[PDB]
């Protein structure tokens, strides 16, 4: 049911993580992280994080992960090894995949589960806020406040990005 959409996305989130965490060829590992990034945006979108969700797409996927794939094609792998052809990768992938399914089966059967810690299984919708009738996006108001309240955050963040340029030029000059 669509009432479990956030949970279903979170399940797909984990499988994508088991994908690249078992570490196939970095070409495929990069693909697994991209799928998890998109699914991670969807989870954030369903909690009212419209701007935050789109930043994952714009910055994490369209920026960072593009640079990761660019670097992989240039300095790591040019031709991917067949996926899961390695034994450890296949074993690690299968091991993680089975753990996720056993988690998902029990939480859905009992509507709760104790995997080390206690988790409710009624659906994430139950904790949502019941009153909202403002004429603005609260997420947008909070993010916009970076320029009024977060003067100090802007200074240190902007400085660190400038030092990022300086440092990387030093590192690579060799």
């Amino acid at each position: 049911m669509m009432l479990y959409i956030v949970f279903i996305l979170s399940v797909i989130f984990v499988m994508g993580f088991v994908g690249f965490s078992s570490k196939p060829s970095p070409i495929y590992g990069g693909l697994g992280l991209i799928v998890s990034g998109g699914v991670g945006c969807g989870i954030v979108l369903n909690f009212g994080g419209s701007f935050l969700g789109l930043m994952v797409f714009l910055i994490y996927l369209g920026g960072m992960m593009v640079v990761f794939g660019y670097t992989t094609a240039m300095a790591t792998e040019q031709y991917p090894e067949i996926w899961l052809s390695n034994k450890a990768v296949l074993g690690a992938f299968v091991t993680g995949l089975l753990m996720e399914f056993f988690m998902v089966y029990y939480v859905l059967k009992d509507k709760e589960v104790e995997v080390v810690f206690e988790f409710n299984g009624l659906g994430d919708w139950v904790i949502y806020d019941t009153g909202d009738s403002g004429f603005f996006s609260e997420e947008a108001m909070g993010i916009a406040a970076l320029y009024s309240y977060g003067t100090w955050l802007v200074i240190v963040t902007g400085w660190s990005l400038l030092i990022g340029v300086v440092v990387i030029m030093e590192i690579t000059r060799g």
């Binding site: 019941t130 009153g131 009738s133 004429f135």
Partner: protein, 48 residues
């Protein structure tokens, strides 16, 4: 030209926002009763 139009758009936004402010007490009065009715209804079924 952009300055003039945006100033008028700010006046039009204020008028729209003031219409919402006029209606907010009525909507708040309704939201309170709807929430309490639902809670009361959930309470009858719990007793059973």
């Amino acid at each position: 030209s952009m300055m003039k139009w945006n100033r008028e758009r700010r006046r039009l936004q204020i008028e729209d926002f003031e219409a919402r402010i006029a209606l907010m007490p009525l909507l708040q009065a309704e939201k309170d009763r709807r929430v309490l009715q639902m809670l009361r209804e959930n309470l009858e079924e719990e007793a059973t």
